[PDB]
Amino acid sequence: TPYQEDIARYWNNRPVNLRLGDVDGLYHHHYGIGAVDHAALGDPGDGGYEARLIAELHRLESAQAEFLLDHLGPVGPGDTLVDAGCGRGGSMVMAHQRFGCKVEGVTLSAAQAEFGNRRARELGIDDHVRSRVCNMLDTPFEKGTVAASWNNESSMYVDLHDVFAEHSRFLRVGGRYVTVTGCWNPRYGQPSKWVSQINAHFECNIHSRREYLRAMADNRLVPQTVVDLTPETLPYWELRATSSLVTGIEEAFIESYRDGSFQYVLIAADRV
Amino acid sequence: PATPYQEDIARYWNNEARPVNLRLGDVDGLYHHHYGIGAVDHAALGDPGYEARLIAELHRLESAQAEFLLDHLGPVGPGDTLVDAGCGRGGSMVMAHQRFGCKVEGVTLSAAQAEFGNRRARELGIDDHVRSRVCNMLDTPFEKGTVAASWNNESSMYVDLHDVFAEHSRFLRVGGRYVTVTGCWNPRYGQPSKWVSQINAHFECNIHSRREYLRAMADNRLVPQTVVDLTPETLPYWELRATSSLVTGIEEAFIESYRDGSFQYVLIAADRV
Amino acid sequence: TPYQEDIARYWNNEARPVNLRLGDVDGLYHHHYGIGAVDHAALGDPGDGGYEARLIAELHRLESAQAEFLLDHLGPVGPGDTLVDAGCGRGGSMVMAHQRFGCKVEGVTLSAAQAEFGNRRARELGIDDHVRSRVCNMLDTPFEKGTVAASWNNESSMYVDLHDVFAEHSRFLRVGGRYVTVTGCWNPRYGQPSKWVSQINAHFECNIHSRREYLRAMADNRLVPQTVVDLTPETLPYWELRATSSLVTGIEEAFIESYRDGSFQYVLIAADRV
Amino acid sequence: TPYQEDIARYWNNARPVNLRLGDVDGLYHHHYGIGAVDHAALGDPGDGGYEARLIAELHRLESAQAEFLLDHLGPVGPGDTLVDAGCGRGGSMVMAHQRFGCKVEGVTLSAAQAEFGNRRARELGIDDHVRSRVCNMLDTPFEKGTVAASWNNESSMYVDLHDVFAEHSRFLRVGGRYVTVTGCWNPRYGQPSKWVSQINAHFECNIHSRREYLRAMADNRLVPQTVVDLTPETLPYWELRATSSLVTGIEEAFIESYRDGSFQYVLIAADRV
Amino acid sequence: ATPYQEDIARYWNNEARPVNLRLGDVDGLYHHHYGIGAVDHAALGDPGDGGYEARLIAELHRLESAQAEFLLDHLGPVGPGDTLVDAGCGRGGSMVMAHQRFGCKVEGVTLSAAQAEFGNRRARELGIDDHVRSRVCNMLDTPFEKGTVAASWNNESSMYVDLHDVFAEHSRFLRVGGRYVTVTGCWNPRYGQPSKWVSQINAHFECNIHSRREYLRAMADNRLVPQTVVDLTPETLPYWELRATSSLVTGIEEAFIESYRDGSFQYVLIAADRV
Amino acid sequence: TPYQEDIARYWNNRPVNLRLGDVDGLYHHHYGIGAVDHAALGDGGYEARLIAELHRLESAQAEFLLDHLGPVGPGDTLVDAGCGRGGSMVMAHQRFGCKVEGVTLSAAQAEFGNRRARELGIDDHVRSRVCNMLDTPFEKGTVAASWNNESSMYVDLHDVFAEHSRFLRVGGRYVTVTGCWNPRYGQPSKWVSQINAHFECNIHSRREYLRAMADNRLVPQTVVDLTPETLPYWELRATSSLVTGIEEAFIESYRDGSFQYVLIAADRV
Ligand SMILES: Nc1ncnc2c1ncn2[C@@H]1O[C@H](C[C@@H](N)CC[C@H](N)C(=O)O)[C@@H](O)[C@H]1O
Ligand SMILES: Nc1ncnc2c1ncn2[C@@H]1O[C@H](C[C@@H](N)CC[C@H](N)C(=O)O)[C@@H](O)[C@H]1O
Ligand SMILES: Nc1ncnc2c1ncn2[C@@H]1O[C@H](C[C@@H](N)CC[C@H](N)C(=O)O)[C@@H](O)[C@H]1O
Ligand SMILES: Nc1ncnc2c1ncn2[C@@H]1O[C@H](C[C@@H](N)CC[C@H](N)C(=O)O)[C@@H](O)[C@H]1O
Ligand SMILES: Nc1ncnc2c1ncn2[C@@H]1O[C@H](C[C@@H](N)CC[C@H](N)C(=O)O)[C@@H](O)[C@H]1O
Ligand SMILES: Nc1ncnc2c1ncn2[C@@H]1O[C@H](C[C@@H](N)CC[C@H](N)C(=O)O)[C@@H](O)[C@H]1O
Ligand SMILES: CC(C)=CCC/C(C)=C/COP(=O)(O)OP(=O)(O)O
Ligand SMILES: CC(C)=CCC/C(C)=C/COP(=O)(O)OP(=O)(O)O
Ligand SMILES: CC(C)=CCC/C(C)=C/COP(=O)(O)OP(=O)(O)O
Ligand SMILES: CC(C)=CCC/C(C)=C/COP(=O)(O)OP(=O)(O)O
Ligand SMILES: CC(C)=CCC/C(C)=C/COP(=O)(O)OP(=O)(O)O
Ligand SMILES: CC(C)=CCC/C(C)=C\COP(=O)(O)OP(=O)(O)O
Ligand SMILES: [Mg+2]
Ligand SMILES: [Mg+2]
Ligand SMILES: [Mg+2]
Ligand SMILES: [Mg+2]
Ligand SMILES: [Mg+2]
Ligand SMILES: [Mg+2]
């Protein structure tokens, strides 16, 4: 909990995030994947370059969010979805618009919760999409009532075994769990300074790919897909590294992705 | 002669050389005892109006997946050593060497397949790099952490997952890479469907669930880097083979099980942590 | 579930004479096999018209014999105790159990047909208020924690995951309670499942486990075996006799042969809920 | 080891209730018996040679269980090797050899018992097949999977179950057979009753629960083939011994604990998978 | 429910040993453990006095209340709103001290209906019966709700149950971040196996002593991370040697003293956090 | 291994360390415990006296560690996982007169250790060598006692304890002084993460230490929190000029209890 408060007294308090959500209305708090489109990007000497760069970055960010939903498997309007650490509800809205089902979000930031519902009412879907302040480790959802859940870059803030144990609980048998995250590669040995820098920067705790796989195995979660998206997210960062929205953590990511001490992966497992 | 089962599973491959695996291995010289992946080039194939071209197409797909497997062995130099658990006739071994120019140690229960492999190995003039030998993949002679990469290309249904991965984990160097292409019944389905059981009775093997594969690896310091379902890629191969005359009579079991999702063809590449 | 949905359809139909014509002479319809020597006396000679009629009786006797043998390992059980039958079939064992202990006997099966058949026959005996079968997955039963005095799996554990099934029994089973199971498992001493075993799996569309899995699964679920006996020699007679009858289903060989070379074995395990 | 040290003390030190029985067959056993008592040929207290007949009866029952144990070692030829963890004076070892004519390696902590065993072994002219040696059953010199069958006849209460079974599992050949006759407190009872604790304090040992035995075996690739409770078979032995004059003063603890079911005498025969 | 406990309950439903009651009278606090800390021989003047034995009982009781106090020192911060649990509370000696020191709720649990009533009886006298309460119940299956207990402990009562099951329970009703403490005697795994001395103690109290190894592993398997692990053998030795010369002797003094000497048995204290 | 190269580099490549080693002759790469000799310290050559005080505290904890190695004769062998420059190794030998095998990833530290070892004329008893503490050459159960003095944050707990448990004799003694984030706090606080990024290491939770030992036949005999004892050391070092810039992270984390300095001595069961 003492750490939980650290996270709450954090997210309840950037440009590189809001200005992008300002274009679509979809506010994301994760990273992008995909080939940069230097077509619509234009050159650095145009009256509205930075404006086009923000659009490109946001596109990539919405791109991975969409990519995540592709692994939630078949899901009808009667099913319920859970978003552990939903942020401002960006992914939640997309999910609903795409499946027209119930989407329950959960976050530690009362600010993010309200922001999500606020934006939810505007779209007139507040009765299907709802964010609430709650710890993803102890959620109110009943056993096996959720068709699919996921963690889009929010698993570095909690204990893997405990979090997957929860998902496994409220997740229906045969249900689908997905997660996009950054984990230090066990093949490298131990967390490199780069990774530690990212932890100190976001005040989180990155896990190894080994922990992710073992944690899932110990919680009746059998991976159906395990793909390394590092090559897909590299473009996003290198582009963001040249912008002015830079937060100062770009190097840590780019470098760690380069030497392979850190990796961006996606895992979709079944609730067996 | 480890166990009574491995006596039958050994006598099997020692006394069984079907046309569907030889006639194909003939076109190249590389003999394969597994299945293929990828789309079918019907253009260059033509219609049944041919059989010689069909064998080439089937063989292409089979060599295609073998190549696909090697793509997941990661970087490997001429100084590294590779192990092939249940190498069969050495098809994959030859390709591996030609592609990396390193040592390739194969291991099989069939003395026939072993000799066949080395025989063909001498012809290519690589017998001093590529070598097959009669031995149980569960108790191999390779020393601890001396192997750069190993794999199981459709041969893990003949042994206990924990024991086999435990062995690989042993002789495999820290940071090494392990890969495996296999067919496992989907735990999402519940239990092995009749189709799967039919395949077991046909090949006298024991197919595992995707759950066992993942847990077994986790219990043996094997962290999966890639886990892809190749069912959609292998379907074409079977449907085509189903129309040929090389048919062995197990085509239906595969096609059907792949269809209803009770059985799946997957590829897993994990690191030796 | 997709798999279980398959076993439901399988049994909803069935109607094998080798199974009904035997439970007719008693009302105790069993869907398992039998142990014990053969009473060739009451058997007689094949050159008789009522021979087949006597063969069915003999086979049924052996089948009811093992069912009785199973109950012998449930330990002391009074009229106030509750018993569970994972995969009860038509209720053959359930009726015997009640008649023998006069207690509650809750059965559970995937076949709605078998369920109704069981209750139907249950009302005839006038015990429907003590013996009841219901359509439900033995892996997720409605019985409350530690309220069951004893439960068992009479040839039905090949249709589910051992850890999950024993975990359930361990749940609703009272501390100190007794669990029993009669099943066929491939002997790990042999190495791997022989073709014979695989043939049996494909035939019944099931999934036989190794004796190793049974023991480990129980150990991981607070189930300590009190008795572990190999009944292969006791069930052999049953099969060899059935192999000569006309009720033959075509899987007789697989069993006989696998039992012979020791790749497959018929065992009974009775463990305590620690 | 400090424990083993003083467990060796005990053993380097001759109960009449032990030697006097073994002096009738040359079969020096150090355990208890099973089987119903033959009152007829036993005798009536109203006679002189009664006690002499009682010793014979008790010894018979003790050799009876030893024989019963060997019945669970499965097939074993003259070429096979057997191990006796905590062999005592070699009683069971001699019987084993005479019955299978194979190598029988014994191991004990008591140098006295070792020499006694070999001494008696030379007399029978089998010292080149049957041999006892001072060594800890937890760290034996036998090579991996070279033993056809091993066992613990009332000697597992002196060591850690996981470690001891781990050892047996090591030197035991795959498919080999392990057997053990012992007394363990029934987990069904809850915890060790005073009776059991009294037995521990008496023999300076550490009785385990039936739960530990089963779990320990499962964790060491030992799958039980047979698990039978011999309490009813050993009761007669004790009740008879309770009336004799060889009484050591621990008879009650056993009889009572067997009665209330807090303690049980069981036999377990498992395969080395 | 269960043969064994069925006994333990019967066992304690008799008790009445003077080496317990005469020592609990001097103060009003009725303990059922042993003491720690050096002995004040000076306070035990002219052995040839009608008051020596009276002073010896006071000294022994002091040492016994001393360790009880020492245990509470490891319960960490605890306010009047928190709830504490005493697995195998005995007559409530430690419970009363705990409350007087923290003024919070103290739930005790024992198998002896006699000890339970005695505890509440004495609890009403102090006028704290609405905060301190003992009840007949198995510490392995307690009625307390999940994570509602701020701190719990086992003061020499863990030898009567299965470590994994008991710690699993504590871990259940114990709040996340909560504190668990336990003072007990366990045979040192460094010695090998339970020496006769230990077995004698088991047969004497009809219990089942565990190894320090089981304690540590059992806790690790139940989300209980030890913050402190101290061997109090040297601190409890004085208590026994003194008690060995008294007339309250129960006949188990030697087993303890000797086992503590050769190191086959040890008196330890463990304070872990509920992670 | 790739990570090992990083750490190797780190060490092959400070004054606050060697300066203090100049006085006694012992070179420690850890920290100190115990109260400060506030009086006899100062308020001209103040800095010279401050270095002596800091070094005293550092040698103090090193000594404190050896106190938990239990009885050890001249015939016994000791292992120092991540020995650094051999400071603790020398003290150990001078105190027990036995064999002291050290192991480090830095060839520089290894040679420095042996160099200094020859000067004291004990090179035939005390020896440092370049090797990974996870895969040491020592034979099974031949070591009487081993330890990790602030070096366990550079390796996997299960693997490292598994090794110690291997070469360590049954009944042997293992000790370790380290900093671990308190699981009671929840997760690693920024302070801890800052320390990781600073030393390029990976701090573990007290939970991992205890579980890892339990899984490797290592039963803790003593578990004491030395945070209050090491606080003085840091606050004093925070005012000196040897400051490396990581002082705050430590002091603060120790304060809010998100990070703790503990000592664990377990037996090889
Ligand atoms: N323990 C926790 N319980 C619930 N939510 C948390 C917890 N820790 C962090 N979070 C939230 O997880 C989210 C992580 C963010 N990167 C947002 C992820 C979100 N999927 C998005 O795409 O925006 C933030 O809202 C954090 O506040
Ligand atoms: N237990 C075993 N140990 C070693 N080899 C085995 C074992 N079981 C089966 N095999 C061999 O593994 C191979 C399985 C075949 N499907 C061939 C696979 C081979 N990788 C190929 O693609 O040609 C055959 O050579 C089997 O004889
Ligand atoms: N998952 C399941 N849940 C409930 N019942 C099942 C399940 N799987 C199989 N069964 C039933 O288990 C029974 C197995 C049969 N051999 C009957 C066993 C029964 N004890 C008897 O001897 O009559 C059948 O009724 C199956 O339908
Ligand atoms: N750690 C040990 N290693 C080897 N033997 C032991 C050990 N501890 C006890 N023993 C022996 O275990 C034996 C137990 C006796 N009851 C003899 C058993 C023997 N199987 C018999 O049938 O007589 C004694 O000879 C002990 O010396
Ligand atoms: N299974 C059990 N469940 C609950 N309490 C038990 C159980 N077994 C023993 N006890 C209690 O353990 C207690 C141990 C006694 N030494 C009292 C300890 C108590 N902390 C005291 O200081 O008095 C006894 O009061 C027993 O009643
Ligand atoms: N894999 C490794 N094998 C051996 N040593 C290592 C390894 N990783 C890190 N280290 C050592 O970790 C040590 C950390 C130092 N603080 C040790 C100081 C030492 N305990 C002393 O007080 O002198 C460095 O000296 C490294 O040499
Ligand atoms: C997909 C699965 C589960 C494969 C198991 C391994 C196996 C029996 C290979 C045989 O291939 P083959 O090429 O030697 O024989 P076939 O003639 O059938 O191609
Ligand atoms: C140990 C093994 C292999 C058990 C098989 C369990 C099973 C499916 C029994 C059905 O018997 P049944 O009596 O209903 O059908 P049949 O009489 O035709 O065999
Ligand atoms: C748990 C069990 C059965 C322990 C028995 C230990 C034992 C055999 C002790 C002495 O040998 P002995 O039994 O030959 O001597 P005695 O018959 O005089 O007790
Ligand atoms: C240290 C160990 C193993 C204790 C277990 C036995 C126990 C609960 C003693 C305390 O009770 P008590 O104080 O009433 O007993 P006694 O009358 O001997 O003081
Ligand atoms: C969690 C903790 C405390 C880990 C220890 C990290 C470490 C190597 C400290 C000593 O460094 P050093 O002595 O080489 O340099 P410094 O002068 O900073 O102590
Ligand atoms: C993948 C990892 C380790 C994430 C940890 C940080 C986090 C939860 C979000 C970062 O994106 P953001 O949009 O919320 O913040 P920013 O884009 O400003 O970095
Ligand atoms: Mg962003
Ligand atoms: Mg082929
Ligand atoms: Mg039938
Ligand atoms: Mg005797
Ligand atoms: Mg007392
Ligand atoms: Mg320093």
- Record the strand order, biggest sheet of chain A: 3-2-1-4-5-7-6
CATH hierarchy: architecture of chain A:
3-Layer(aba) Sandwich
**Helical residues, percent of chain A:** 40-55%
What's the number of domains of chain A?
1
Our measurement of the CA-to-CA distance between the termini of chain A, rounded to an integer number of angstroms, reads 30 Å
List the quaternary state of the chains.
Answer: homohexamer
Please count the helical segments of chain A: 11
The CATH superfamily of chain A appears as: Vaccinia Virus protein VP39
CATH structural class of chain A = Alpha Beta
The outline of chain A comes out as: globular
Q: What's the CATH topology name of chain A?
A: Rossmann fold
Strand content of chain A: 15-25%
Beta-strand segment tally of chain A: 7
User: How can the largest sheet of chain A be summarized?
Assistant: 7 strands, mixed
Cofactor (chain D): Mg(2+)
Protein name (chain D): Geranyl diphosphate 2-C-methyltransferase
Organism (chain D): Streptomyces lasalocidi
Keywords (chain D): Magnesium, Methyltransferase, Plasmid, S-adenosyl-L-methionine, Transferase
